[PDB]
Structures are given as structure tokens and as C-alpha cells.
Design a binder for this molecule. Structure first.
Ligand SMILES: O=C(/C=C/c1ccc(Sc2ccccc2OCc2cccnc2)c(C(F)(F)F)c1C(F)(F)F)N1CCOCC1
Length: 182
């Protein structure tokens, strides 16, 4: 019944300042819409390294997406997606950071490029994983296919490709049409 959701967002060199900002604003829009629900949130920036920008405990105490992401600094390096997903699985989904042990775990990965690392995501198998690929780096079918290995199956449900960062607004509009009292 409880949902612990992690935004895992790309901070690579390829992102223009306005594009990075549009990611931040998308995340804030989602959190504001799902205030006072069974959702609790954490946000992790990934590039070459990984940083928990705020954790679940932070969200519970402040419930203020604007304040929680206010100190985010764009890393401007690579795109270590494998390492990032593993970091979330092992280092973020923990009591110490306010994760609830019996909650449904969800990961929202937001990226504008292919992974610069390798390996596996076995550690994250118990997490429902969605991935949003954004921009000109994902023009080809082949490039989009590379993201499937990070998301839950089927790709038709868990993988979304956006032409531009402006389309995050459209995605947020679409998302809200899927909100229900169950
Ligand atoms: O809380 C959630 C999920 C929330 C969620 C899901 C996706 C996404 S993005 C996404 C990324 C890839 C593909 C589509 C996507 O969204 C469109 C969509 C969603 C659901 C149904 N139809 C269209 C998002 C996003 F955060 F907006 F990115 C969420 C949530 F907002 F809730 F956190 N769930 C579903 C799994 O079981 C627990 C409840």
C-alpha cells in the first residue's frame, strides 16, 4: 500500500542548463500532485558519481519539493546508469534514509544518453523500474532499445522516449490522467 519512489536523474555534461532545470521541475510537479498520499520520495542525481539530493526522511519532515531540490548542483560528467541503479538499490532503499521496509519500491530513471558503464542490475530486481529517455540522443530505435535493460518489462509500459525536454510538461499532463482513488 505504501510506495517509496526514487527519482534517479541524469546530470551528464550533455544536458544544457535549461534541460537539467526542466527535469528538476518535472520531479517537483509530480511530488506536489502526490502530496499527502501513501507516496514518499527520494531524489538521486547521477553522472559519473551518485548523490542523494534528499531522502525519504527529508521528504516526510519538510514535504516541500522546492526546498528539497534547492541545493542541487549539475554534475556535468558521464552517465553511469548501471552504477546509479545499483547505488539506489543498495544505498537509498534503506531505513537509515527513511525507506519503509514493506513498501512497494518504485524507481523513475530520467536520462538523455546511453550508459557509459557496464554490468548488471540484479540488485534492483525487487524494484518496479520506469525509464524516461529524452532528446536527440534517442532518435534511433537502437538507442531506445538500449534503455529496456534498465526498466521493468514490458518496455511498452515502463519505457518512455521524449523528443524534447519541453515534452516533460506533456508527460505530466498524461500522468495526471492516470491518477485514481482506488
Ligand atoms: O506509482 C506508480 C507509478 C508512477 C509513475 C509511473 C511512471 C512515471 S513516468 C513514465 C515512465 C515510463 C512510462 C510511462 C510513464 O508515465 C506515463 C504513464 C504512467 C502510468 C500509466 N500510463 C502512463 C511517473 C512519473 F513520475 F511521472 F515520471 C510515475 C509517478 F509520477 F507516479 F511517479 N505506480 C505504478 C506501479 O505500482 C505502484 C504505483
Amino acid at each position: 500500500g505504501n510506495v517509496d519512489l526514487v527519482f534517479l536523474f541524469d546530470g551528464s555534461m550533455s544536458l544544457q542548463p535549461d534541460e537539467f532545470q526542466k527535469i528538476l521541475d518535472f520531479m517537483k510537479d509530480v511530488m506536489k500532485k502526490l502530496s499527502n498520499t501513501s507516496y514518499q520520495f527520494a531524489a538521486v542525481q547521477f553522472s559519473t558519481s551518485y548523490k542523494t539530493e534528499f531522502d525519504f526522511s527529508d521528504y516526510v519532515k519538510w514535504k516541500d519539493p522546492d526546498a528539497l531540490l534547492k541545493h542541487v548542483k549539475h554534475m556535468l560528467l558521464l552517465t553511469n546508469t548501471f552504477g546509479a541503479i545499483n547505488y539506489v538499490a543498495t544505498e537509498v532503499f534503506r531505513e537509515e534514509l527513511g525507506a519503509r521496509p514493506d513498501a512497494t519500491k518504485v524507481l523513475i530513471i530520467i536520462t538523455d544518453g546511453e550508459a557509459t558503464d557496464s554490468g548488471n542490475i540484479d540488485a534492483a530486481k525487487d524494484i518496479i523500474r520506469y525509464i524516461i529517455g529524452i532528446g536527440k540522443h534517442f532518435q534511433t530505435k537502437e538507442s531506445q532499445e538500449t534503455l529496456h535493460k534498465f526498466a521493468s518489462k514490458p518496455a511498452s509500459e515502463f519505457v518512455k522516449i521524449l523528443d524534447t525536454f519541453e515534452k516533460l510538461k506533456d508527460l505530466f499532463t498524461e500522468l495526471q490522467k492516470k491518477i485514481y482513488v482506488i
